[PDB]
mmCIF file of C-alpha atoms in Angstrom:
data_model
loop_
_atom_site.group_PDB
_atom_site.id
_atom_site.type_symbol
_atom_site.label_atom_id
_atom_site.label_comp_id
_atom_site.label_asym_id
_atom_site.label_seq_id
_atom_site.Cartn_x
_atom_site.Cartn_y
_atom_site.Cartn_z
ATOM 1 C CA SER A 1 -16.017 32.866 8.889
ATOM 2 C CA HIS A 2 -12.892 30.707 9.018
ATOM 3 C CA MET A 3 -14.880 27.540 8.025
ATOM 4 C CA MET A 4 -13.924 25.778 4.936
ATOM 5 C CA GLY A 5 -17.380 25.448 3.657
ATOM 6 C CA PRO A 6 -18.334 22.119 2.101
ATOM 7 C CA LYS A 7 -16.164 18.724 2.428
ATOM 8 C CA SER A 8 -14.465 17.381 -0.500
ATOM 9 C CA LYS A 9 -12.611 14.185 -1.295
ATOM 10 C CA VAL A 10 -9.232 14.190 -1.753
ATOM 11 C CA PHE A 11 -8.658 12.843 -5.609
ATOM 12 C CA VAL A 12 -5.279 11.123 -6.116
ATOM 13 C CA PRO A 13 -4.185 10.515 -9.552
ATOM 14 C CA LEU A 14 -1.480 8.063 -8.178
ATOM 15 C CA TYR A 15 0.746 7.501 -11.359
ATOM 16 C CA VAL A 16 3.791 6.795 -8.961
ATOM 17 C CA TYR A 17 5.294 3.617 -9.655
ATOM 18 C CA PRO A 18 5.097 1.680 -6.374
ATOM 19 C CA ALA A 19 8.713 0.976 -5.839
ATOM 20 C CA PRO A 20 9.231 0.395 -2.094
ATOM 21 C CA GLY A 21 8.527 3.458 -0.007
ATOM 22 C CA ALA A 22 6.896 5.228 -3.050
ATOM 23 C CA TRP A 23 3.623 5.487 -2.034
ATOM 24 C CA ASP A 24 4.169 6.098 1.659
ATOM 25 C CA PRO A 25 3.177 9.936 1.285
ATOM 26 C CA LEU A 26 -0.089 8.655 0.246
ATOM 27 C CA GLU A 27 -0.429 6.170 3.062
ATOM 28 C CA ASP A 28 0.724 8.784 5.739
ATOM 29 C CA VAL A 29 -2.005 11.201 5.173
ATOM 30 C CA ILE A 30 -4.375 8.528 4.758
ATOM 31 C CA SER A 31 -3.640 7.216 8.200
ATOM 32 C CA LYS A 32 -3.283 10.858 9.740
ATOM 33 C CA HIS A 33 -6.625 11.816 8.486
ATOM 34 C CA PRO A 34 -9.233 8.913 8.576
ATOM 35 C CA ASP A 35 -11.743 11.283 8.327
ATOM 36 C CA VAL A 36 -10.906 12.387 4.996
ATOM 37 C CA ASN A 37 -11.841 9.914 1.972
ATOM 38 C CA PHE A 38 -9.575 9.586 -0.475
ATOM 39 C CA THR A 39 -10.337 8.583 -4.332
ATOM 40 C CA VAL A 40 -7.187 6.974 -5.459
ATOM 41 C CA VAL A 41 -6.669 6.269 -9.390
ATOM 42 C CA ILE A 42 -4.128 3.500 -9.894
ATOM 43 C CA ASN A 43 -2.706 2.853 -13.285
ATOM 44 C CA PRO A 44 -0.273 0.375 -14.114
ATOM 45 C CA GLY A 45 0.359 1.069 -17.894
ATOM 46 C CA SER A 46 -2.466 3.229 -19.226
ATOM 47 C CA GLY A 47 -4.863 0.194 -18.136
ATOM 48 C CA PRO A 48 -4.392 -2.804 -16.048
ATOM 49 C CA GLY A 49 -1.749 -4.024 -18.223
ATOM 50 C CA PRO A 50 -1.387 -6.695 -20.911
ATOM 51 C CA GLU A 51 -1.632 -9.694 -18.073
ATOM 52 C CA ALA A 52 -4.476 -10.956 -15.738
ATOM 53 C CA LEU A 53 -2.380 -9.247 -12.822
ATOM 54 C CA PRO A 54 0.031 -5.988 -12.527
ATOM 55 C CA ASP A 55 3.593 -6.603 -11.344
ATOM 56 C CA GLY A 56 4.880 -7.619 -7.969
ATOM 57 C CA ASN A 57 5.092 -4.060 -6.924
ATOM 58 C CA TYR A 58 1.527 -3.348 -7.583
ATOM 59 C CA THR A 59 0.474 -6.604 -6.107
ATOM 60 C CA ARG A 60 2.421 -5.789 -2.820
ATOM 61 C CA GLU A 61 1.244 -2.108 -2.320
ATOM 62 C CA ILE A 62 -2.388 -2.017 -3.596
ATOM 63 C CA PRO A 63 -3.745 -4.266 -0.601
ATOM 64 C CA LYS A 64 -2.150 -1.898 1.777
ATOM 65 C CA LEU A 65 -4.092 0.986 0.229
ATOM 66 C CA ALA A 66 -7.326 -1.002 -0.362
ATOM 67 C CA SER A 67 -7.053 -1.867 3.461
ATOM 68 C CA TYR A 68 -8.053 1.618 4.466
ATOM 69 C CA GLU A 69 -11.657 2.005 4.887
ATOM 70 C CA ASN A 70 -11.159 5.933 3.791
ATOM 71 C CA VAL A 71 -9.858 4.951 0.553
ATOM 72 C CA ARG A 72 -11.628 4.034 -2.530
ATOM 73 C CA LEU A 73 -9.137 2.784 -5.422
ATOM 74 C CA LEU A 74 -10.222 2.856 -9.019
ATOM 75 C CA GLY A 75 -8.723 1.078 -11.957
ATOM 76 C CA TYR A 76 -7.499 3.614 -14.987
ATOM 77 C CA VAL A 77 -9.092 2.652 -18.267
ATOM 78 C CA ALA A 78 -8.631 4.608 -21.536
ATOM 79 C CA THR A 79 -11.379 5.666 -24.063
ATOM 80 C CA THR A 80 -9.670 7.473 -26.431
ATOM 81 C CA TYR A 81 -12.550 10.066 -26.578
ATOM 82 C CA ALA A 82 -14.906 7.396 -27.061
ATOM 83 C CA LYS A 83 -13.177 6.157 -30.009
ATOM 84 C CA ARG A 84 -11.610 3.094 -28.511
ATOM 85 C CA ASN A 85 -13.305 0.031 -29.301
ATOM 86 C CA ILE A 86 -15.946 -0.746 -26.559
ATOM 87 C CA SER A 87 -14.641 -4.575 -26.495
ATOM 88 C CA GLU A 88 -11.037 -3.253 -25.508
ATOM 89 C CA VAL A 89 -12.565 -0.866 -23.113
ATOM 90 C CA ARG A 90 -14.388 -3.597 -21.598
ATOM 91 C CA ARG A 91 -11.407 -5.979 -21.362
ATOM 92 C CA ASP A 92 -9.490 -3.585 -19.389
ATOM 93 C CA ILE A 93 -12.699 -3.101 -17.028
ATOM 94 C CA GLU A 94 -13.009 -6.686 -16.794
ATOM 95 C CA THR A 95 -9.300 -7.312 -15.890
ATOM 96 C CA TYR A 96 -9.353 -5.197 -12.856
ATOM 97 C CA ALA A 97 -12.522 -6.690 -11.967
ATOM 98 C CA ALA A 98 -10.817 -10.072 -11.914
ATOM 99 C CA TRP A 99 -7.903 -9.002 -9.891
ATOM 100 C CA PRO A 100 -9.032 -10.487 -6.414
ATOM 101 C CA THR A 101 -10.496 -13.824 -7.810
ATOM 102 C CA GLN A 102 -7.122 -13.953 -10.023
ATOM 103 C CA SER A 103 -4.826 -13.452 -7.320
ATOM 104 C CA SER A 104 -6.966 -14.760 -4.467
ATOM 105 C CA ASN A 105 -6.202 -11.925 -2.568
ATOM 106 C CA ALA A 106 -9.588 -9.963 -1.512
ATOM 107 C CA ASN A 107 -7.694 -6.842 -1.218
ATOM 108 C CA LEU A 108 -5.969 -7.127 -4.556
ATOM 109 C CA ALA A 109 -8.854 -4.934 -5.911
ATOM 110 C CA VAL A 110 -10.525 -1.675 -7.140
ATOM 111 C CA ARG A 111 -13.846 -0.216 -6.374
ATOM 112 C CA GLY A 112 -14.611 1.088 -9.711
ATOM 113 C CA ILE A 113 -13.461 2.617 -12.685
ATOM 114 C CA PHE A 114 -11.663 5.713 -13.976
ATOM 115 C CA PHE A 115 -12.321 6.702 -17.626
ATOM 116 C CA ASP A 116 -9.911 8.904 -19.005
ATOM 117 C CA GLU A 117 -10.274 11.024 -22.006
ATOM 118 C CA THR A 118 -14.060 10.803 -22.171
ATOM 119 C CA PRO A 119 -15.463 13.505 -24.760
ATOM 120 C CA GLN A 120 -16.662 16.931 -24.209
ATOM 121 C CA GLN A 121 -18.998 17.194 -27.325
ATOM 122 C CA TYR A 122 -22.700 15.983 -26.961
ATOM 123 C CA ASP A 123 -23.632 13.300 -29.441
ATOM 124 C CA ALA A 124 -26.448 10.315 -28.665
ATOM 125 C CA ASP A 125 -23.999 7.521 -29.851
ATOM 126 C CA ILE A 126 -21.095 8.825 -27.519
ATOM 127 C CA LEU A 127 -24.060 8.990 -24.576
ATOM 128 C CA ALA A 128 -24.932 5.282 -25.262
ATOM 129 C CA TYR A 129 -21.091 4.355 -25.390
ATOM 130 C CA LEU A 130 -20.774 6.000 -21.916
ATOM 131 C CA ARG A 131 -24.105 4.675 -20.426
ATOM 132 C CA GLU A 132 -23.060 1.017 -21.501
ATOM 133 C CA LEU A 133 -19.564 1.547 -19.883
ATOM 134 C CA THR A 134 -21.474 2.504 -16.475
ATOM 135 C CA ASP A 135 -23.736 -0.594 -16.822
ATOM 136 C CA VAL A 136 -20.419 -2.870 -17.327
ATOM 137 C CA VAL A 137 -18.825 -1.181 -14.259
ATOM 138 C CA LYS A 138 -22.185 -1.674 -12.163
ATOM 139 C CA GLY A 139 -22.869 -4.947 -13.380
ATOM 140 C CA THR A 140 -19.337 -6.593 -13.456
ATOM 141 C CA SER A 141 -18.406 -8.693 -10.060
ATOM 142 C CA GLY A 142 -15.049 -7.597 -8.253
ATOM 143 C CA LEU A 143 -15.736 -3.774 -8.474
ATOM 144 C CA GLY A 144 -17.907 -3.546 -5.435
ATOM 145 C CA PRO A 145 -19.367 -2.438 -3.060
ATOM 146 C CA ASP A 146 -18.983 0.780 -4.781
ATOM 147 C CA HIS A 147 -18.893 0.357 -8.445
ATOM 148 C CA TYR A 148 -17.860 3.714 -8.913
ATOM 149 C CA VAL A 149 -17.396 5.694 -12.199
ATOM 150 C CA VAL A 150 -15.361 8.553 -12.853
ATOM 151 C CA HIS A 151 -15.058 10.242 -16.109
ATOM 152 C CA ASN A 152 -11.948 12.472 -17.181
ATOM 153 C CA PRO A 153 -12.714 14.726 -20.158
ATOM 154 C CA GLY A 154 -9.955 17.236 -18.597
ATOM 155 C CA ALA A 155 -12.255 20.050 -19.470
ATOM 156 C CA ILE A 156 -16.072 20.880 -19.092
ATOM 157 C CA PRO A 157 -18.367 18.284 -21.043
ATOM 158 C CA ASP A 158 -22.105 18.661 -22.357
ATOM 159 C CA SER A 159 -23.798 18.333 -19.088
ATOM 160 C CA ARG A 160 -26.046 15.597 -20.150
ATOM 161 C CA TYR A 161 -22.686 13.569 -19.464
ATOM 162 C CA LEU A 162 -22.647 14.155 -16.012
ATOM 163 C CA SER A 163 -25.231 11.687 -14.761
ATOM 164 C CA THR A 164 -23.423 9.016 -16.455
ATOM 165 C CA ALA A 165 -20.841 9.133 -13.834
ATOM 166 C CA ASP A 166 -20.399 9.596 -10.235
ATOM 167 C CA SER A 167 -17.821 12.213 -10.733
ATOM 168 C CA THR A 168 -16.265 14.204 -13.842
ATOM 169 C CA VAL A 169 -13.010 15.803 -13.934
ATOM 170 C CA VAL A 170 -14.442 19.195 -15.380
ATOM 171 C CA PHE A 171 -10.844 21.047 -14.942
ATOM 172 C CA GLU A 172 -7.198 19.549 -15.409
ATOM 173 C CA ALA A 173 -4.879 22.127 -16.122
ATOM 174 C CA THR A 174 -2.356 24.563 -14.288
ATOM 175 C CA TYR A 175 -3.107 27.018 -11.879
ATOM 176 C CA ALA A 176 -2.218 29.736 -14.383
ATOM 177 C CA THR A 177 -5.083 28.389 -16.708
ATOM 178 C CA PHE A 178 -7.503 28.291 -13.338
ATOM 179 C CA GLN A 179 -6.922 31.954 -12.924
ATOM 180 C CA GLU A 180 -7.285 32.791 -16.367
ATOM 181 C CA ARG A 181 -10.865 31.504 -16.363
ATOM 182 C CA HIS A 182 -11.463 33.032 -13.037
ATOM 183 C CA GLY A 183 -11.306 30.062 -10.809
ATOM 184 C CA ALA A 184 -14.381 28.706 -9.260
ATOM 185 C CA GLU A 185 -16.633 31.154 -11.588
ATOM 186 C CA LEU A 186 -15.676 28.464 -14.228
ATOM 187 C CA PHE A 187 -17.823 26.074 -12.306
ATOM 188 C CA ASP A 188 -20.907 28.364 -12.204
ATOM 189 C CA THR A 189 -21.053 28.122 -16.312
ATOM 190 C CA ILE A 190 -21.909 24.397 -16.042
ATOM 191 C CA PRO A 191 -25.600 24.036 -16.303
ATOM 192 C CA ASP A 192 -27.642 20.933 -14.963
ATOM 193 C CA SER A 193 -24.587 20.295 -12.200
ATOM 194 C CA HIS A 194 -23.805 20.278 -8.708
ATOM 195 C CA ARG A 195 -20.743 20.023 -6.833
ATOM 196 C CA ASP A 196 -20.798 16.538 -5.820
ATOM 197 C CA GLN A 197 -20.733 15.485 -9.532
ATOM 198 C CA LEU A 198 -17.583 17.498 -10.089
ATOM 199 C CA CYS A 199 -13.615 16.890 -9.520
ATOM 200 C CA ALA A 200 -10.865 19.732 -10.021
ATOM 201 C CA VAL A 201 -7.463 18.929 -10.878
ATOM 202 C CA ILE A 202 -4.693 21.907 -10.317
ATOM 203 C CA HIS A 203 -1.291 21.370 -10.950
ATOM 204 C CA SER A 204 1.742 23.462 -11.374
ATOM 205 C CA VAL A 205 0.434 25.845 -8.563
ATOM 206 C CA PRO A 206 3.608 28.390 -7.663
ATOM 207 C CA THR A 207 5.173 27.786 -4.590
ATOM 208 C CA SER A 208 4.119 31.181 -3.190
ATOM 209 C CA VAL A 209 0.595 29.987 -3.197
ATOM 210 C CA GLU A 210 1.153 28.598 0.368
ATOM 211 C CA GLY A 211 0.122 29.228 4.117
ATOM 212 C CA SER A 212 -3.354 31.442 4.323
ATOM 213 C CA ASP A 213 -3.000 31.846 0.340
ATOM 214 C CA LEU A 214 -3.477 28.039 -0.192
ATOM 215 C CA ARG A 215 -6.330 27.892 2.475
ATOM 216 C CA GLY A 216 -8.177 30.240 0.331
ATOM 217 C CA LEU A 217 -7.529 28.518 -2.785
ATOM 218 C CA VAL A 218 -8.723 25.114 -1.266
ATOM 219 C CA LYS A 219 -11.952 26.778 0.262
ATOM 220 C CA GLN A 220 -12.562 28.142 -3.160
ATOM 221 C CA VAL A 221 -12.449 24.939 -4.823
ATOM 222 C CA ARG A 222 -14.333 23.240 -2.230
ATOM 223 C CA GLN A 223 -17.415 25.214 -2.944
ATOM 224 C CA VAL A 224 -17.573 23.970 -6.353
ATOM 225 C CA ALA A 225 -16.242 20.628 -6.642
ATOM 226 C CA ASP A 226 -16.476 17.471 -4.280
ATOM 227 C CA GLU A 227 -13.174 15.842 -5.203
ATOM 228 C CA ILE A 228 -10.033 17.857 -5.518
ATOM 229 C CA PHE A 229 -6.258 17.464 -6.339
ATOM 230 C CA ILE A 230 -3.946 20.574 -6.033
ATOM 231 C CA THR A 231 -0.373 20.127 -6.516
ATOM 232 C CA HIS A 232 2.651 22.490 -6.860
ATOM 233 C CA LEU A 233 4.660 20.245 -9.129
ATOM 234 C CA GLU A 234 4.842 21.523 -12.744
ATOM 235 C CA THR A 235 6.788 18.421 -14.162
ATOM 236 C CA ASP A 236 5.462 14.814 -13.249
ATOM 237 C CA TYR A 237 2.612 16.327 -11.381
ATOM 238 C CA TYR A 238 0.836 12.776 -11.419
ATOM 239 C CA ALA A 239 4.070 10.736 -10.661
ATOM 240 C CA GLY A 240 5.292 12.317 -7.421
ATOM 241 C CA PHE A 241 3.998 14.281 -4.291
ATOM 242 C CA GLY A 242 4.190 18.000 -4.370
ATOM 243 C CA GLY A 243 6.280 19.933 -1.630
ATOM 244 C CA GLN A 244 2.843 21.160 0.208
ATOM 245 C CA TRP A 245 0.994 17.800 -0.370
ATOM 246 C CA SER A 246 0.644 17.322 3.495
ATOM 247 C CA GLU A 247 -0.366 21.040 3.863
ATOM 248 C CA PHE A 248 -3.026 20.488 1.264
ATOM 249 C CA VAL A 249 -4.380 17.524 2.689
ATOM 250 C CA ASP A 250 -4.425 19.106 6.177
ATOM 251 C CA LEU A 251 -6.706 21.753 4.663
ATOM 252 C CA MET A 252 -8.926 19.194 3.271
ATOM 253 C CA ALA A 253 -9.208 17.688 6.401
ATOM 254 C CA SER A 254 -10.398 21.307 7.863
#
C-alpha cells in the first residue's frame, strides 16, 4: 500500500529570528496545506524575554501565524530539568498568557506552552512539579482555547510523565542516532504510551535521504509519533529551513 498511515502534526521549533521575510517558508507551507496541523514553538529569548512583550519583529510576525486556523502557537519556557524555580517558570507562562491583553492585540497570543528540558527520571516531587505546571497552563487566561502542554525531555522519560502533557518530545537527535537505535523500533520500548502522546524531532538527515527515501522515513515516523519535525540541516537546525522542508511538509500532507 502506498498510503502513509496515521496523520501527524508538523512540529516546528521556530527558533528563527522574525526578521522581515524570515518566517515566509513556514507561512508558505501553512497556506499551501490547510489540511495539515502545525504546532509552532516560538521562543523570543529562551522564554518570552525580560519584558511584558517581545520585540517589534515578534509583535508583527506572531499575529500573522496566529491568524491561520491550522496553526497552534506555543510559548517556549525552560525548566532546567525541573530544577528551575517554579515561580520563575510561572512568570514566563504568565508573560505569554498576558500578551494579548498587554498588547491589545487578540492575535498576539499563544495557545499553550512548550516546556523545554523536562527530566527523564521518575521522582514523585518532579511529577508534582510537572502536574502543577500543567494546572497553571490550563488555568491561565490568555492560553486558550487549547491550553496545550508539550514537554521536551529530548529522550524517553519515565512513562508516568506522558499523561501530564498533550505531547512529549521523546526523540530529539540526529538521523544517525535515530538509525543506531533502529528508528521507529525505539518507540516500541516505551510502556503505557500511544503515538498521540509523542513527538519526534530528527535533524541532520543526510541529503541523500530524498525522494522515495524521505517518503519512507516520514511514513515510519508517522506510525509512532503524532507530531514530527524532520530537517536536513546539521547546523542551526531550529534556526533555518532545511533544503527539503517543502518536500517534508508535502509528505506530511499525504
